[PDB]
Write a protein that binds this ligand. Sequence first.
Ligand SMILES: [Fe+3]
Ligand SMILES: [Fe+3]
Ligand SMILES: [Fe+3]
Ligand SMILES: [Fe+3]
Ligand SMILES: [Zn+2]
Ligand SMILES: [Zn+2]
Ligand SMILES: [Zn+2]
Ligand SMILES: [Zn+2]
Ligand SMILES: [Zn+2]
Ligand SMILES: [Zn+2]
Ligand SMILES: [Zn+2]
Ligand SMILES: [Zn+2]
Ligand SMILES: [Zn+2]
Ligand SMILES: [Zn+2]
Ligand SMILES: [Zn+2]
Ligand SMILES: [Zn+2]
Ligand SMILES: [Zn+2]
Ligand SMILES: [Zn+2]
Ligand SMILES: [Zn+2]
Ligand SMILES: [Zn+2]
Ligand SMILES: [Zn+2]
Ligand SMILES: [Zn+2]
Ligand SMILES: [Zn+2]
Ligand SMILES: [Zn+2]
Ligand SMILES: [Zn+2]
Ligand SMILES: [Zn+2]
Lengths: 173, 172, 173, 172, 173, 172, 173, 172, 173, 173, 172
Amino acid sequence: SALPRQAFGEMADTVILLEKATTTPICEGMNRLLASFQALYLQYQKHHFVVEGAEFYPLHQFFQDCYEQVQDHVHALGERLNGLGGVPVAGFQQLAALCCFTPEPEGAFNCRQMLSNDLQAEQAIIGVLRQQATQAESLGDRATAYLYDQILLKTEERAYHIGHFLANDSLKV
Amino acid sequence: ALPRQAFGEMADTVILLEKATTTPICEGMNRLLASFQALYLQYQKHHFVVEGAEFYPLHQFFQDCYEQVQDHVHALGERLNGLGGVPVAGFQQLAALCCFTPEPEGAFNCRQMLSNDLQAEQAIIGVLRQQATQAESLGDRATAYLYDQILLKTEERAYHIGHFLANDSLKV
Amino acid sequence: SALPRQAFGEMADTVILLEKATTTPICEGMNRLLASFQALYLQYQKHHFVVEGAEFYPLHQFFQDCYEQVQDHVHALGERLNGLGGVPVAGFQQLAALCCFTPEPEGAFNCRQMLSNDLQAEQAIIGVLRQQATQAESLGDRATAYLYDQILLKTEERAYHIGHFLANDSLKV
Amino acid sequence: ALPRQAFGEMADTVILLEKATTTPICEGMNRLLASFQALYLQYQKHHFVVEGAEFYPLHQFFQDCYEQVQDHVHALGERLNGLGGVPVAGFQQLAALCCFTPEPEGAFNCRQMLSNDLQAEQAIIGVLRQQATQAESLGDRATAYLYDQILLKTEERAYHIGHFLANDSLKV
Amino acid sequence: SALPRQAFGEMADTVILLEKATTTPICEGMNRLLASFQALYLQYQKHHFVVEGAEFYPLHQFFQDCYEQVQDHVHALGERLNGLGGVPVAGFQQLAALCCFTPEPEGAFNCRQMLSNDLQAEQAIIGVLRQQATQAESLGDRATAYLYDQILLKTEERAYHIGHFLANDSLKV
Amino acid sequence: ALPRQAFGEMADTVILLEKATTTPICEGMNRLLASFQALYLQYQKHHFVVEGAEFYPLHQFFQDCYEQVQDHVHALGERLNGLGGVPVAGFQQLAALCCFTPEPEGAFNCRQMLSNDLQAEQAIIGVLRQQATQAESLGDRATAYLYDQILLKTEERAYHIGHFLANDSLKV
Amino acid sequence: SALPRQAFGEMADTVILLEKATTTPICEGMNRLLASFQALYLQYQKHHFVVEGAEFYPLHQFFQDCYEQVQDHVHALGERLNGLGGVPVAGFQQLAALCCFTPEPEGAFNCRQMLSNDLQAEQAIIGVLRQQATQAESLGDRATAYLYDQILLKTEERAYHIGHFLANDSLKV
Amino acid sequence: ALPRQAFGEMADTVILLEKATTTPICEGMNRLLASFQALYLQYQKHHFVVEGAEFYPLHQFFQDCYEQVQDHVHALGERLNGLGGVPVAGFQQLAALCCFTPEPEGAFNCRQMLSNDLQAEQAIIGVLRQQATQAESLGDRATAYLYDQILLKTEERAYHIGHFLANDSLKV
Amino acid sequence: SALPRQAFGEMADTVILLEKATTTPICEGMNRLLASFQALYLQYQKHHFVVEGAEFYPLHQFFQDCYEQVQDHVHALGERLNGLGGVPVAGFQQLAALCCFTPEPEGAFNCRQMLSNDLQAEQAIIGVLRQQATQAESLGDRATAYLYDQILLKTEERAYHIGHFLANDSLKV
Amino acid sequence: SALPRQAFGEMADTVILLEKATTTPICEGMNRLLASFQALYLQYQKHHFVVEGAEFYPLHQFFQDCYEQVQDHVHALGERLNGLGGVPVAGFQQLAALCCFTPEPEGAFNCRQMLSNDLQAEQAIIGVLRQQATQAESLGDRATAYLYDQILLKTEERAYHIGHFLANDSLKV
Amino acid sequence: ALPRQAFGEMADTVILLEKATTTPICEGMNRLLASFQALYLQYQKHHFVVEGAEFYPLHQFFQDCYEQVQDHVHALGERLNGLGGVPVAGFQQLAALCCFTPEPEGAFNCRQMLSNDLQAEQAIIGVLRQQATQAESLGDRATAYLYDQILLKTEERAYHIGHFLANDSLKV
Ligand SMILES: [Fe+3]
Ligand SMILES: [Fe+3]
Ligand SMILES: [Fe+3]
Ligand SMILES: [Fe+3]
Ligand SMILES: [Zn+2]
Ligand SMILES: [Zn+2]
Ligand SMILES: [Zn+2]
Ligand SMILES: [Zn+2]
Ligand SMILES: [Zn+2]
Ligand SMILES: [Zn+2]
Ligand SMILES: [Zn+2]
Ligand SMILES: [Zn+2]
Ligand SMILES: [Zn+2]
Ligand SMILES: [Zn+2]
Ligand SMILES: [Zn+2]
Ligand SMILES: [Zn+2]
Ligand SMILES: [Zn+2]
Ligand SMILES: [Zn+2]
Ligand SMILES: [Zn+2]
Ligand SMILES: [Zn+2]
Ligand SMILES: [Zn+2]
Ligand SMILES: [Zn+2]
Ligand SMILES: [Zn+2]
Ligand SMILES: [Zn+2]
Ligand SMILES: [Zn+2]
Ligand SMILES: [Zn+2]
């Protein structure tokens, strides 16, 4: 019924003075990253809620640190995207379509599976971050490339922290 | 692979409540969890896209709202699992259980956004009261209490939105 | 039934060594200021509770800053008044009688009316503050004059902040 | 010398509740106070003596638990006196009113310790619900509320222990 | 039914490399101090809950400061005892048997009696602290002696603070 | 009396960059310094003089802005010296290097104030991109990094101003 | 580019019940102080950036302490001036024209010279602060008098701190 | 060895006040410094030795008092030097300048202690008024301001002591 | 003006179970330290007020750090002495008489002289601290020994910090 | 004493989707920086311990500021290197062998010499940071490039702060 | 260039201890400094390289450990200079004075890492006792006090490592 001020998939001009030929592909990629980070945030939260077993407390905390940091990326990207003249994704349908990894299905999985799913997700996002950071640089959008690099550093760090959790070492003697 | 506990499935809880109590409580908690999760997304969108004469107040207001809703999500998500259920997580399942109609894609004006938020809060207030009542009735005293705690904040958000929408201003 | 240790409108000696001829008129004026600040505090609180409309959130906050700061003046004056050997006003009847402005009537008013009422109140208090500060100085009560000046600075600041809210400028285009 | 108010004795309260309400409430509050006091001691012991592969998490977990239980003790101890009763204090009287079986002397393994803690919390959850229900029923609204507040945290501790005990780990 | 990993009154080796002939008597004394501090903690807490009369608020607070500080000693001793290869006391029976003072009987006593009981308790603990600190030094356990001295300083301080409360001076004119 | 280093004179840096690199870099950095210094003064003025229906939030926004800008001033002035240059400080030189046209004396309406601020941020955005690209190209990695960091914040202030200026409002 | 709502050098009415006969001379003087403090903030900041040599670190810190305190004076004065119904100076020409001291020329001078220039600036401002405070008192603007004295105390304090820096003493052999 | 500046010798101040102004002002400021220094020592002693029924609150009050007084000491000693004088520091000179009679050695009862403290504050109140009036009259606005600020706090300590000494009590 | 409850130089019983044979010599020595630290606090404070020249700022700060740390020692000692059953010195005559070093004469000296006087004071106090700690240990007052060692560590640290200030090195060409 | 899970100088796979062709040279260079920063932390800490003379206090503080900031670089680099699939250096032989500057010999040198040695160290590290950042960018490791630039900015800043300390200016007559 | 004070050269201390006291005391303090410095590096390495089922808590434990050890380093290095000695700083001298055998290069399993850390703490515990006893005996009360304080913390780290290494686990 009600028509929006700016339709989804429509570009407005940005006051930071970058051409639409620059902002359009950047927003396209940023919405994919937004959606992917949003899914990852929900997934990490889920994993915080449901994790159990011998490594419960450490994983419980780790999963919270992850979704809180990922929440930060969501915030940064959604706000910048709008700033660039785009419309950030917010509905379940379009969020699911733009997500760059396959989320864990509903239901509770064991802790190794949860971590593996989270790692695969981070790895998928790492791939998109690099591709999008290279694009931003290429197109002259310096701040975006800088922001993505900032996000990439913490995202990679999250990935190899999961890697360590899954490694084959233990105090079990 | 399949999960160790399916969605919709109930496990036993260590907190000495029977399935007949935990089951309808968890099912209601999931509807509420989905709705809060959907409302967090909506407020956050509004924070991202709001503009105009009241940009700064609404900007900050939407953030306060979604951060407060994030607290409810955490509380409900963890309680639900504690009660022996499986909390809703992903986009498609959230869409299925959300108790209000989420805003369509696209950026709408600030009055429309606030109205959408108010309706969302009202739908949630509706469910909160009924679920808290059910929990009291079934003897889950702590769930009823938690819901009441959340209700107080939720009503407060709702009537704060109402004030923003009210027919008054400094414009003379 | 029970008789007070010190009756209202009765002066005791102060340990800070100022004559009754000094402390009596100073306490008389300070009770008027106490009562006036008490009414203003309640009024600002009211305005915080009831304000609505397009400028809801900013006014909501502003009204709170005001009653919190005014609360501070109430505290300072009530305690000093007792220190000077007087009895601070505390009952509704005498509070209403000593108040130096007309408070807003009961019921909810619009935001421009609320601000106008608050401004008139502050202006009435400003007038009494200057008169009382000049008196204290004149009578040799240095600390009182200093305290009133301190209160006057913040009170005036509150007044012109209300003035700005009511000014004829807007982003409404 | 003899006390000005004996143990088991009720005085009048200034909060306008009659003996017929305050008496059974205080008696229940004492059972709960003793049990929390006994649970604080147990968690603290576990904090002192835990070792093995999950030393650091359990170490910290046991401390969080007893510190949270210390908060309940304070709340109940002070409320009980406020209601006109005498709070249990010493070792032997605590032993008499404790609603669970305390762990024997000696250091046990970490699974046993957690199981003992879970049973302790469950026994306490049992009493909490019944005492809160009694308080609502008798019209002591604030006691019922306080108990609910404590119940929420107590259930949360219980199901956190359950998760630790659950059959899952990173061991592949 | 279930047998412990380490039975109460049984000594394991400590990784801090002190002989059992050293650690055994030290743990024996430390368990007495643990039990005594545990009783004192409960007693101070009780006194916080039940204190009334003209000096209610100050005593209320003081009793809390005491049990919080005593709680700290409990923590330090229980953890070190286990570290030394002993088993800390935790059951009501053995706690009552190892306590070095007679605790106040159940029921509410007046404020002077409560303080006197608390003072006698502190004095009993002071005696054991000195004896045990001298032993630790004598046996070459330097850190224990240091820890006890640290605890002794605060314990003595608590004692003479109670002493002052009970002294025969007052503003009562 | 003569200065240790004259304005416009380049000294060697301890950070191992040739003068042919530091000279153009300091030249640009002085323009940005002067521009940020002017924008700081402008935002501060706006904080002082703003009034009307949106007085309070604009009052706050302007202060957030100048405080953030003062942080850019600090970083650039200090790095410029570090690089072996001399930072501008005087009114005449500031006026000469500034990359936007400053608001004239007088108290303007809040829409005009915001528009002047946007234009100032836009002019600065252009210079930052230019100077960042130059620093990278010359191998002053740290300056390029610093500029990007400042550019991200500057663009953010710019689009926040844009939102304030947009044609939307709660007044229906 | 529209006209200003209030032109520079034009007085508006104040909400705080002071006549234009009072507010006009006060605002004129307040603008000279505003400009002076604004130039001094810049100078101190410059000195923070450029200072080097044997006392680099303490001078580096001292100059920052100074300019941060000066910007507080700026804030207070700019906002008070506006509240009084005047227009605060913000452009480079008029800031240069109203400044009550001669700013240091462009270029990096030695630390002794920098400190001497700062002291001369403080001294010129001290002179103006006293005249203006006296004027405010004289005209019945008690709050402006108070604010000035408050600023004067901090300013004199900076001045004699610089004095000590310049004093003929050191730890050198 | 001889001092850079002898006690009782006036140097010029950088704050542009003639010696005919600073000399009497520093003279009085030294008396206040010595008096506050003595009162600091007295309040501190009282904090050490107080006992009885009101031990704890008096213990606290005395400490609040000396800490506030130490703040007056700091401000006056530093301003006095700033003004071109030399602050008193030695026991003999302190004893000579002090405006009240200090409590003799020994531990007195808490009523006596409080009374001595009141008398000390009263003596100081008199000097502050005198010295503040003088500073104003001589055109040392900032000193007068500082004295008034200190006087407000000092009068407040004085009437707080007065209240402690009043003939009222909970003991019926 | 009534008599003291406990005369100066008279010993009362202590609640901490130490005999007068022990507490008397300990309190005598503790009073000498109390007086010395009291004189040193004054001296360091004086130095804070008067220091000027090339190292004004760091010396200004250092002297404040010093006197604030010294007043903590004063607090600890005054309260411990009282708790032991003695009477702490507070009058100017006896403070001068019990002080274990010669205070700096009145007047503003140079910074090197000020530092040398402070070092000599610390050194005299260091001597007394060691004798008194040894005595406390010897007499079985373990807590006083501990408190003294605690104070000694901080005191020696101040002493060698002054030493470094006075050392024959600088950044001057 | 078992074998290491990953031998020094051996590369493991990284979870962040960078090939060994990329991670190997990056980790090699990162280890040289790790060792260098490790030696510099030690040096700055040493300088904190030993500095004396007329600028004792500010240099004392500056050296602590420096080593604390350097240990943050160490933390970041050690953890990043591991996350990339390498093995961080921690033994004394290899720390000495991989260090990119010559550490100050044992003994306490003068403050000018200490500062010069620190500047030379920073300069050598600045050189390596630039090569390594360029290499990381070149090989497509965007996050390592970003981290290095982040560290470079702080490092250059320390370097020119030392420069100012050494500069030919002072407050001496 | 030659140092102001050569390594192994003793200067006089301002704290009035003869060289015959300070020399052996500084000798031992340098060994402890070197040992703590090495243990700091080792704990830090362990923090970097740890992985597996107990990754997170061990990651945290190692960091708590090295930060506490860095505090011991600071206190000893500074006191050693204060005492008139020269603290070790170079890799070769550090390696020479260290009282335990440091872990070789390479990433070892978490059990090995913990065992190396325990052994290091044990070796250090022995030296601390020796050096503390010596300081007391020589009349350096403050050094003995400092060593005891450090020893208490060191023993605590040691028995915490012991607990981690114990044969208990939640995995049944
Ligand atoms: Fe109910
Ligand atoms: Fe006046
Ligand atoms: Fe000893
Ligand atoms: Fe690049
Ligand atoms: Zn949890
Ligand atoms: Zn935001
Ligand atoms: Zn980590
Ligand atoms: Zn924003
Ligand atoms: Zn949680
Ligand atoms: Zn509200
Ligand atoms: Zn009050
Ligand atoms: Zn304002
Ligand atoms: Zn622990
Ligand atoms: Zn309480
Ligand atoms: Zn209470
Ligand atoms: Zn612990
Ligand atoms: Zn005390
Ligand atoms: Zn800076
Ligand atoms: Zn700096
Ligand atoms: Zn402002
Ligand atoms: Zn000071
Ligand atoms: Zn100062
Ligand atoms: Zn005290
Ligand atoms: Zn130091
Ligand atoms: Zn880390
Ligand atoms: Zn240090």
